[PDB]
Amino acid sequence: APVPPLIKEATYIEATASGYMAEGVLNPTIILRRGQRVDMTLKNKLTEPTIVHWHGFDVNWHNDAHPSFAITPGESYNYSFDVVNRAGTYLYHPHPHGLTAKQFYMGQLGLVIVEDSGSDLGFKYGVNDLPLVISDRRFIGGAPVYNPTPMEMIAGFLGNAVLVNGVKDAVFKLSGGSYRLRLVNGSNARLYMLSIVKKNGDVVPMRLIAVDQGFLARPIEVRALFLAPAERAEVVVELGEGVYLLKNTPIDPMHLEMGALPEGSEYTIATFLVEGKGEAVPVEALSDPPPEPPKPTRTRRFALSLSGMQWTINGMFWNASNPLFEHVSVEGVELWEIVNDKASMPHPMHLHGFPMWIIERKDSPRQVAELAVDNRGRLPTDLGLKDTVLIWPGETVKIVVNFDAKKRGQLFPFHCHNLEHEDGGMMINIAVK
Ligand SMILES: [Cu+2]
Ligand SMILES: [Cu+2]
Known part of the structure; x- marks a missing residue:
């Protein structure tokens, strides 16, 4: 473990x-x-x-x-x-x-x-509270290399093997019982669609209990979870004896921006060898629901686009020479309408300093729409307070943010958490007024 x-x-x-x-x-x-x-x-x-x-x-x-x-x-x-x-x-x-x-x-x-009071829910870190930090690497001679081409700066740097907590071919030896798995995408760019399966058996339902900024109001049963860079999703699973696999299962990664381990290929990320009987940890209720969203006073539209060799946000991008450049001035409670162009790729957009309520997904790809759990197109992970949200090409995601006036006069990055996009300048300053 x-x-x-x-x-x-x-x-x-x-x-x-x-x-x-x-x-x-x-x-x-x-x-x-x-x-x-x-x-x-x-x-x-x-x-x-x-x-x-x-x-x-x-x-x-x-x-x-x-x-x-x-x-x-x-x-x-x-x-x-x-x-x-x-x-x-x-x-x-x-x-x-x-x-x-x-x-x-x-x-x-x-x-x-x-x-927080009762947040461990009865699980113990390193025993049945297991962080799984999922990080891919481009191995050459068994050693990671970071050598992106200009095209990989545009698309993201994808590895050819996936680590969990720094470990190749991660194996967890567990006893039968309840497990809280803190799924963390620690990859530079790779998107995952995560499922837990019995080896040569059925999909294990996962009970989603928390995301980026904390607990959901109630657990939600899911069979699969999209998890883009810097997203976090905590799930509870019941493992009986046997062999289970944390897997990526097939997706359309929608690399539409420019025309070794494909993002939509199926592969095992971690193996759980479950032997013995251990503690069952009941999780029937959560005691820390997210606040309802505030009421916005203005709508602000954001377009995600590739401007030549430069990813942009409302056409803007980082000013390397002036890191204090004030790209966008904001105030109060805003609704951000984030539109990803069709000739683009999924972007995990992340806002510093202020969490985000997800209000609505529109024009999502079917693989996303099929997993939504309400009439507003929202995924189970969209039902918690978030700070990193994946927006697919052609899709519109509406969020609400409270730019707390106590932070007036400060700058906070808004950027894509695909680290090649980020290093490539897909990042702007939000100036709170
Ligand atoms: Cu991006
Ligand atoms: Cu951040």
């Missing part, structure tokens, strides 16, 4: 090429309590600038940290903030402009778990 090691006291972290080093362990899971104070110093031990981003955290832009605050090698950066996020599974990872994909892919990515 290989999962990241746990630490509570994240006081000092070193950015190294292989990953984050804290208290002698690599990429540990930082576990925090809702409401606690975080004081943490980042030391840059790389040969290039970097900065840590607390993915999904409600903090100011000094603690986000905005990419403009990146530190040079040998420098340090202090983070100090109160955790006001809902209990859930978050990430910490690099955010220097133009260097994030490589640093992230070469190993700098860890989990941040936020806990």
Whole structure:
């Protein structure tokens, strides 16, 4: 059962090429309590600038940290903030402009778990609460390489094998019982459609309980889950004795932007060898429903498009020379109508600083529409509070965001979490007024 090691006291972290080093362990899971104070110093031990981003955290832009605050090698950066996020599974990872994909892919990515009264639901981390950080790699001679061509910067850098928690061909040896699996897409670009199946047997229903920004109102039974880069979905499964497989199953990846392990091919991501009898953990109710969405005062349309060799948002993209460029000025509660062009590819769009309520999916591909659970085209994952949402070519996704006036005068990136798209500039500053 290989999962990241746990630490509570994240006081000092070193950015190294292989990953984050804290208290002698690599990429540990930082576990925090809702409401606690975080004081943490980042030391840059790389040969290039970097900065840590607390993915999904409600903090100011000094603690986000905005990419403009990146530190040079040998420098340090202090983070100090109160955790006001809902209990859930978050990430910490690099955010220097133009260097994030490589640093992230070469190993700098860890989990941040936020806990709250009763949020562990009776499961124990590393026993039956299992994070599965799914990361693909392009292996050459059994070693990962990050060498995207210009066409791979446009499309995303896809690996030829899939790791779980850094482990090739991951195998989990478990006893029969209940398992909470925290599915995390830690890949640069690869999309997954995830299912758990009995080997040579039937699909195991998964009971979705939480996504990016925390618990659903109630568990939802699903047979398959789309999980794009930086999305998180926590499910509960009942495993009897036998062999089970976490698999990717076939999809149309809709690479329509420009005319080794295909995204829609079927393959095993992890194997569960279930022997013995262990604890059953009943999960009948969740005690932390997401808030209802606020009422927006204006509608703002966003078009996702390829402008030549440059991915853009409303035609705009990162100004490498001016990281404080104010691409969009916002205020109050807004409804964002995010339209992905037909000649495009799926984009997992992610907003810093402010979570998002998903209101509606329109013109989704059938493989998505078939999984929706309401009249507004919403997927089960769309029913929780989110911070990263996948928008398919031709599809319109409507979200509502509250640009809290307490954050006036700060800048927060809005960007695609396909890291090649991000390093390629598919990122703009949202300036809160
Ligand atoms: Cu983020
Ligand atoms: Cu993208």
